[PDB]
Amino acid sequence: APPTLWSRVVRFGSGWGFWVSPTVFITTTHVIPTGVREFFGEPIESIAIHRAGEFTQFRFSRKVRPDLTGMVLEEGCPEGVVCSILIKRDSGELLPLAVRMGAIASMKIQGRLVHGQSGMLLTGANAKGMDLGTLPGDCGAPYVYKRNNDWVVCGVHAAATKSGNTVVCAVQA
Amino acid sequence: APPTLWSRVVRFGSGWGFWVSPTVFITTTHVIPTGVREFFGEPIESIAIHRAGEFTQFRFSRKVRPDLTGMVLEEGCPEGVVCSILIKRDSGELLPLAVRMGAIASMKIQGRLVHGQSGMLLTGANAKGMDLGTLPGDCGAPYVYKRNNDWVVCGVHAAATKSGNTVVCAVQA
Amino acid sequence: APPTLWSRVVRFGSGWGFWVSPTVFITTTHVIPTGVREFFGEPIESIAIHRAGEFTQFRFSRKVRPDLTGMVLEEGCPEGVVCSILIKRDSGELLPLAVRMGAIASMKIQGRLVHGQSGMLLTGANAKGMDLGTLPGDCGAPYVYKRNNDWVVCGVHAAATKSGNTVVCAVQA
Amino acid sequence: APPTLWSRVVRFGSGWGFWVSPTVFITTTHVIPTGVREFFGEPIESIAIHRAGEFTQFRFSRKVRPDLTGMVLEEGCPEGVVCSILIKRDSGELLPLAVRMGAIASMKIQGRLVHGQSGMLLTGANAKGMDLGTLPGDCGAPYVYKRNNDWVVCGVHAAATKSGNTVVCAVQA
Ligand SMILES: [Hg+2]
Ligand SMILES: [Hg+2]
Ligand SMILES: [Hg+2]
Ligand SMILES: [Hg+2]
Ligand SMILES: [Hg+2]
Ligand SMILES: [Hg+2]
Ligand SMILES: [Hg+2]
Ligand SMILES: [Hg+2]
């Protein structure tokens, strides 16, 4: 993509994470590393982690990414809306996939209990290896969309159904 | 769908229900009880009732619909597949709403938490004051789909969010 | 829905057609019957037919539907938006299906050449019998949708592919 | 998709092309460079070009890529199927855009009329300034899908509606 926004999406542990701003940041709780007193090479005390369930924000004071504009980031997405989820993979394939946003709810996905905003993939249903649906490793991916005026992030890729038809994204609200 | 299949959706309560077999009848739990004694004109003590949450099955002792054939009642729709929620509106009308079935969940729909298999409707943003979604009073309508050559049932309509699109199907489990 | 909107969807020859206004009415050209006279009990000159393509309007002096407040009658709809088909059928089944809309080519869907604007149904890739798809008899049926807190008509059903995936919207030129 | 499938997609003309096998190579037409006595360095005269409208196949004399193996090239894919366009950027980046396949058609995307198998892309609902969809130089890329356990090629990227999701694939047909 000519990338102001795929490449704000970066690898972060077992998963991914997103730069909504040079100051702000989004990523999925279960994805964060254990082992540590430091991330984006910064003093772990310096920043305001404001973690919520399976969502987790980072409020930075710094040039971290002086290369990014800052993004609007709303509570959830209204139900109905078709957001996109920005997935990077290993051959670093960039796989945006339309997600038709659902309700907020808790759920039984891959045994676990996930609270976040549900949604269904437009690539119909089935995934077998890497192309039409989501994988274990995509957590952290953002769920962006474009309002009238600007882009907005709505959440992070938190989890998915065995067939990959339904996904849940960790949110703010 | 066919006449003989709508034959089996009957009013029941503040709601509706479904004749899966001659002896078996399915409906949504929140409409049935009121505080009672007997159903379909028969003794409660002569029915085996099975409540799994929002779902409820009655298995009677005598054939209350000998005209019916006997359906399969799977235990939930398989994620991915698209069912037809068989609504009878009390106004002579039939509205066989299409839905993609998602994961099991629990939303917080108006005043209360509901559990069951969630799902997206296949219509725009559905609910509206008046629109093309489920309206209060539809609960208990079956969710049926044609597997092979056969027509089957997964569950019944328990609830649906207010911004439309989302619905919940109660299921045997 | 309750029929106030479905009330503008009356039967019409081969097919259907749609009261947009009381003065006004849309339908697919191929469905208009073998040449006659008088329609909706008015006669030809009352009426100024100003049909063009497979789209056909009818304007009259006589408020034929006064109960109805004419709607905005746009040409197509932008790409993406999902509009609602509003299929009235043989059994009095209302069947609103959703269509993420597309460009306006000329495809050839059956062994006939159909110009209008394409769309895909959200129910899928499989409409085998009574399913979640359009049918031969549906032509005429309206595509509707909410633009502001207002209801715009975008077109009528011209054709569909053997699988139901892809359908064509006849538009006013 | 795997990396041996992407090692197939090379730049060509003003767009790109696909190595179906060692011999055979495929691309859309309007990207073929204009005047010239040879390509992929072997001499024109020894190549068998088959042009089928927007689609063009070059069968070579000698294995020009013995590193790979030869795959199935169907006549286009089937409607409703979801394929992936193996879109390469000139910057390195790999972007397999998901699309759902529809009718053959013909539309005038900008300057002229393109005919091919139309499709709808599955990422939010559009492309822009910089996005989720095609860019003018992407013509030529393949549209693959996995059949049993193997990958097949159903056609090449011929064009796309500006501000939109619609896409046109050139095919054998
Ligand atoms: Hg979103
Ligand atoms: Hg989201
Ligand atoms: Hg079902
Ligand atoms: Hg179900
Ligand atoms: Hg439309
Ligand atoms: Hg339309
Ligand atoms: Hg394909
Ligand atoms: Hg194709």
Side-chain angles (χ1 to χ4, degrees):
Chain A
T4 324
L5 129 190
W6 268 97
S7 343
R8 11 249 276 204
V9 143
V10 242
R11 181 118 33 173
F12 190 138
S14 46
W16 295 89
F18 181 77
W19 302 90
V20 19
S21 265
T23 144
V24 215
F25 165 135
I26 275 52
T27 192
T28 310
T29 301
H30 77 263
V31 92
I32 298 156
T34 33
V36 330
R37 128 294 191 175
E38 115 86 58
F39 38 47
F40 281 138
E42 258 9 67
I44 173 292
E45 351 304 325
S46 68
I47 14 173
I49 282 159
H50 306 298
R51 178 176 12 122
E54 186 80 84
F55 169 21
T56 305
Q57 178 161 186
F58 292 23
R59 196 320 168 283
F60 289 91
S61 31
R62 259 224 62 184
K63 321 189 79 149
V64 295
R65 252 108 201 172
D67 43 273
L68 324 158
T69 333
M71 203 169 321
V72 156
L73 136 40
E74 166 63 68
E75 326 188 17
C77 304
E79 225 199 65
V81 64
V82 176
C83 297
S84 312
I85 126 176
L86 271 357
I87 296 296
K88 307 183 178 231
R89 229 81 137 169
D90 278 23
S91 340
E93 268 192 326
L94 286 66
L95 184 72
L97 289 195
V99 185
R100 176 156 147 91
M101 274 354 267
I104 353 289
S106 348
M107 16 183 117
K108 262 76 113 282
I109 294 88
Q110 34 175 126
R112 1 180 263 290
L113 177 174
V114 197
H115 193 303
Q117 147 110 78
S118 80
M120 239 141 46
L121 246 51
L122 264 45
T123 37
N126 282 125
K128 69 304 282 122
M130 49 61 281
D131 24 89
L132 275 5
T134 247
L135 321 161
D138 292 351
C139 305
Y143 277 49
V144 313
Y145 75 119
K146 30 195 133 229
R147 219 142 351 154
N148 206 50
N149 276 235
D150 45 317
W151 252 310
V152 22
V153 185
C154 149
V156 231
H157 164 27
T161 279
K162 329 62 219 224
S163 57
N165 167 264
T166 300
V167 290
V168 189
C169 107
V171 315
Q172 191 81 74
Chain B
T4 111
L5 187 73
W6 288 101
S7 167
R8 61 235 289 199
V9 172
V10 303
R11 183 152 247 285
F12 181 98
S14 221
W16 305 88
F18 189 71
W19 288 96
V20 40
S21 105
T23 98
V24 187
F25 173 85
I26 245 75
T27 184
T28 277
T29 311
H30 63 234
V31 47
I32 94 155
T34 38
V36 312
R37 227 151 282 186
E38 82 220 324
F39 354 71
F40 286 100
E42 118 153 16
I44 228 140
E45 30 289 356
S46 55
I47 315 329
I49 301 166
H50 305 120
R51 208 250 166 105
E54 201 91 52
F55 178 81
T56 306
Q57 185 154 190
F58 298 160
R59 164 81 127 292
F60 285 110
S61 295
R62 43 170 283 231
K63 334 234 205 4
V64 187
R65 303 261 326 234
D67 54 296
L68 307 176
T69 340
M71 282 192 43
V72 180
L73 211 206
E74 175 189 314
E75 43 285 285
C77 167
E79 145 112 6
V81 353
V82 54
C83 286
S84 242
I85 132 72
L86 257 46
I87 285 93
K88 244 149 176 179
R89 219 97 93 185
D90 351 24
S91 76
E93 97 186 22
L94 309 113
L95 257 182
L97 311 178
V99 235
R100 212 122 37 81
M101 289 334 288
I104 267 171
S106 16
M107 30 262 109
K108 30 69 172 137
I109 311 171
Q110 60 104 97
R112 143 144 317 334
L113 116 133
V114 187
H115 177 287
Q117 196 161 359
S118 73
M120 295 204 337
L121 244 27
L122 282 12
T123 353
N126 305 265
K128 290 251 141 161
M130 353 85 139
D131 236 80
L132 359 304
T134 41
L135 87 253
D138 275 351
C139 23
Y143 286 50
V144 294
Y145 65 89
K146 214 155 177 342
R147 165 99 90 6
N148 211 64
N149 35 308
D150 276 349
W151 224 307
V152 312
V153 252
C154 325
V156 296
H157 189 51
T161 62
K162 231 347 132 75
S163 227
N165 266 53
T166 310
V167 307
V168 297
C169 158
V171 297
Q172 234 331 324
Chain C
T4 297
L5 193 42
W6 298 88
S7 64
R8 309 166 101 123
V9 180
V10 264
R11 194 130 214 175
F12 205 102
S14 246
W16 302 69
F18 176 92
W19 291 115
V20 14
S21 243
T23 37
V24 207
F25 163 126
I26 302 162
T27 189
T28 143
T29 286
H30 103 240
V31 104
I32 328 322
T34 126
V36 336
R37 222 132 195 175
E38 83 96 73
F39 28 53
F40 286 130
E42 259 56 335
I44 227 180
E45 161 164 14
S46 334
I47 305 73
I49 324 267
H50 212 242
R51 182 222 68 100
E54 174 111 76
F55 184 66
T56 293
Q57 276 204 348
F58 286 32
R59 186 71 107 315
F60 334 75
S61 230
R62 201 283 177 290
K63 257 210 175 214
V64 210
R65 266 124 131 320
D67 26 326
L68 346 155
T69 327
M71 314 170 59
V72 172
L73 174 354
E74 274 177 17
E75 296 200 3
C77 78
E79 283 194 58
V81 36
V82 322
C83 293
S84 291
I85 302 350
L86 327 203
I87 283 163
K88 269 217 50 2
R89 222 94 130 181
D90 190 279
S91 203
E93 297 195 303
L94 291 54
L95 170 64
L97 296 166
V99 217
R100 175 163 164 68
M101 290 312 261
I104 56 297
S106 333
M107 358 254 89
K108 46 15 339 132
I109 310 297
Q110 295 264 282
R112 273 305 300 262
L113 168 98
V114 160
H115 180 304
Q117 129 161 244
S118 47
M120 278 162 185
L121 245 52
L122 260 82
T123 73
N126 178 272
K128 182 60 218 133
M130 304 91 183
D131 252 72
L132 278 341
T134 55
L135 278 186
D138 300 15
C139 312
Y143 283 43
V144 291
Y145 98 92
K146 277 208 6 115
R147 192 171 149 71
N148 320 136
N149 165 85
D150 282 313
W151 244 324
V152 15
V153 188
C154 75
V156 294
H157 186 247
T161 33
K162 3 60 154 73
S163 98
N165 193 232
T166 300
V167 288
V168 193
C169 215
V171 303
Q172 176 237 244
Chain D
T4 324
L5 186 86
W6 294 112
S7 60
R8 282 179 200 242
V9 177
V10 331
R11 227 236 161 16
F12 186 91
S14 72
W16 298 95
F18 191 84
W19 272 111
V20 20
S21 95
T23 44
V24 190
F25 171 83
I26 269 161
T27 183
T28 83
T29 322
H30 79 261
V31 141
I32 314 174
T34 155
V36 298
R37 50 87 92 190
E38 67 116 60
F39 27 40
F40 290 156
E42 55 125 23
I44 230 329
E45 31 272 12
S46 69
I47 331 305
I49 307 65
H50 155 83
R51 165 192 182 173
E54 246 324 285
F55 178 103
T56 317
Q57 177 173 295
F58 300 77
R59 196 121 160 290
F60 291 100
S61 300
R62 72 202 115 286
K63 295 132 339 268
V64 173
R65 216 107 183 339
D67 58 346
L68 32 69
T69 159
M71 31 177 325
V72 174
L73 203 216
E74 335 232 67
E75 249 146 65
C77 60
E79 216 218 311
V81 168
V82 181
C83 283
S84 274
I85 304 56
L86 273 35
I87 293 164
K88 248 150 191 199
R89 287 303 222 239
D90 279 338
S91 292
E93 340 185 67
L94 267 39
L95 292 89
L97 300 194
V99 277
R100 159 93 48 35
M101 300 307 260
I104 258 169
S106 135
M107 88 198 37
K108 17 64 240 156
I109 62 70
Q110 211 13 57
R112 215 242 268 205
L113 233 80
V114 316
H115 175 308
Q117 180 164 13
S118 49
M120 198 165 84
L121 254 74
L122 310 0
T123 8
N126 285 96
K128 139 197 310 183
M130 281 102 292
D131 276 34
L132 271 15
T134 50
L135 238 39
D138 304 341
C139 311
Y143 278 59
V144 312
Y145 75 117
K146 0 47 183 125
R147 229 188 350 190
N148 13 66
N149 51 126
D150 322 289
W151 249 293
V152 337
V153 210
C154 109
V156 296
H157 187 67
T161 63
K162 231 93 178 109
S163 77
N165 296 126
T166 272
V167 118
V168 178
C169 173
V171 313
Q172 260 192 152

